Amino acid sequence: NSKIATMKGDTITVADFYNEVKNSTASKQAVLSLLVSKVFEKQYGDKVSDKEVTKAYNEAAKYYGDSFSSALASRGYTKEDYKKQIRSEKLIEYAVKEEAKKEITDASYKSAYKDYKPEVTAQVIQLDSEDKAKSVLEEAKADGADFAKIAKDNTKGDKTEYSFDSGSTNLPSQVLSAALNLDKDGVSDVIKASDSTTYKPVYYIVKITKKTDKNADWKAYKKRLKEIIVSQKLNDSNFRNAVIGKAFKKANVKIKDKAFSEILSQY
Amino acid sequence: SKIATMKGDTITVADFYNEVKNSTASKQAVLSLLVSKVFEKQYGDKVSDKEVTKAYNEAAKYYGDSFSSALASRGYTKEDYKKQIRSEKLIEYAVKEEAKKEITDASYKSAYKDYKPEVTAQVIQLDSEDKAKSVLEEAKADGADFAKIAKDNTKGDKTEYSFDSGSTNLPSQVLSAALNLDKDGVSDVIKASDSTTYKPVYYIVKITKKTDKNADWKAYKKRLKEIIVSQKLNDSNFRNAVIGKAFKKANVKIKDKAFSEILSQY
Ligand SMILES: [Cl-]
Ligand SMILES: [Cl-]
Ligand SMILES: [Cl-]
Ligand SMILES: [Cl-]
Ligand SMILES: [Cl-]
Ligand SMILES: [Cl-]
């Protein structure tokens, strides 16, 4: 198309260049990125505001602090490519969440009520040492239980008052799940759980404070249950590849150059 | 000129170029092409595509059948590899030729200065430093014993080696230290290392036949002429210079600012 470098005789052109990086595994990620952008920018471009993109960018900075500038250059990213990738993950997210709320049927709300426990409120005791978890346990199982005290005088940190459903993100699955099975004013056992980043086995002790009735009507919890089916679909690759496989067809996307033929081998 | 199409929008090669031009991988692509074309019109007839095929076959036999997967693990193709062997040979020939031009008499003076006559010794290669001591002391009985205890002890294939101060037969340690002995005599346990593994190898050199310096140039020229080349040949700083010159002759100049300082190192 254009010229890149000149020399006596032959010269480098945008074509000669493309003919080299054309089959580059890194080029496939580029073409596929332009498709996702142009497609979702026309079908959802107005949905996600450039104001939301900023909020996410500013938070991304506040976290890495004065390391953000470095952290980016590290994994090969300019401060414009990052703020540009935050928008795409937010477009595909908006699309993945509206279509996840369309397919919802009756059988789904009924297959989501089976394995669902009502919201609970307990006194959690997080610990790093397992022998200390076995210690606070017998103190909790004494004549003067006084669990709340044992908690506030031993917890690894954070708080002691925790509220959670069955499919809610608040405590490790191990804890979250074993905790619900307990009944009104029921003390747990030493629960071993991995950490989100340090993988340092954290040991928890939970005691149910206030709990409610399981209930039997599905329409009763359509609020929680509905946002839970979306929460799962939104976290499912096969479903995300699918909503992309849809938008791409709705945009009648069709590759011309063979090199990138296997790009939509998952859409 | 277009890559993919859609409803009311199109992805042309222009959009793509404006996406990966500032990429680090793309900077290498421009350079590789710029390097090839220049060394092709200036030294293409010097490197025969028949000489590249032999160099390629050597790589194959070495990696054996795993050559296919090996290239895949490095991201190379089975043509891009052979393609790289050519540019790796064009530049190599330019360095040898270019380095064999500004050769001055003073260059031969600084070469004969620290040079030493070619010597032949009955070397011994060992794994553990422990036996490296055992073989030495048992070699200190009558003297001529070292001969037989050098055949059934050396971990290497041959014992007789022919080297000077510019060869790369034995390690630099076991090389220079082996040129500090007399016409005859053994040496101390030289602690060296392997190229493939880091395993420390312990050598024991024994001079058998030596020559002597002739305090002259041509007395040792074809050797002091190859050493200067092999030195500028392995000097990255000088290698950059030849590229800087080839590019200077082809009057090379970039037009897109997206690849401005790609020759700042050249
Ligand atoms: Cl829609
Ligand atoms: Cl609190
Ligand atoms: Cl249960
Ligand atoms: Cl002089
Ligand atoms: Cl004998
Ligand atoms: Cl031999």
Author numbering:
A (entry chain A): 28 to 294
B (entry chain B): 29 to 294
Paper excerpt:
Here, we solved the protein structures of two secreted parvulin and two secreted cyclophilin-like peptidyl-prolyl isomerase (PPIase) ATP-independent chaperones found in gram-positive streptococcal species. Two types of ATP-independent extracellular PPIases exist in pathogenic streptococci: the parvulin and cyclophilin families. Unlike cytoplasmic PPIases, extracellular PPIases have canonical secretion signal peptides that allow for their translocation across the cell membrane via the Sec pathway. These chaperones are lipidated to the outer leaflet of the membrane and function in the space between the bacterial membrane and cell wall.
Other streptococcal-secreted PPIases, such as S. mutans PrsA (SmuPrsA), are required for cell wall and membrane integrity and virulence in an infective endocarditis model. Additionally, the secretion of mutacin, the major factor in the colonization and establishment of S. mutans dental biofilms, is dependent on SmuPrsA. As key streptococcal virulence factors are dependent on PrsA for activity, we began characterizing streptococcal PrsA by determining the X-ray crystal structures of PrsA from S. pneumoniae and S. mutans. The SpnPrsA and SmuPrsA structures were solved to a resolution of 2.55 Å and 3.15 Å, respectively. As expected, SpnPrsA and SmuPrsA align well with an r.m.s.d. of 2.36 Å across 264 Cα atoms that share 49% sequence identity. Consistent with PrsA homologs, both streptococcal PrsA proteins have a central parvulin PPIase domain (SpnPrsA residues 143–241) linked to a foldase domain (N- and C-terminal regions). Furthermore, the streptococcal PrsA protomers are linked by a domain swap; protomers A and D each donate a segment of α1 and the β1, β2, and β7 strands to the domain swap. The interprotomer, three-stranded β-sheets formed by β1, β2, and β7 strands are presumed to interact with the cell membrane. Previous work of L. monocytogenes PrsA homologs has shown that dimerization is critical for PrsA function. This is consistent with our dimeric SmuPrsA structure, as is the dimer of dimers observed in the SpnPrsA structure.
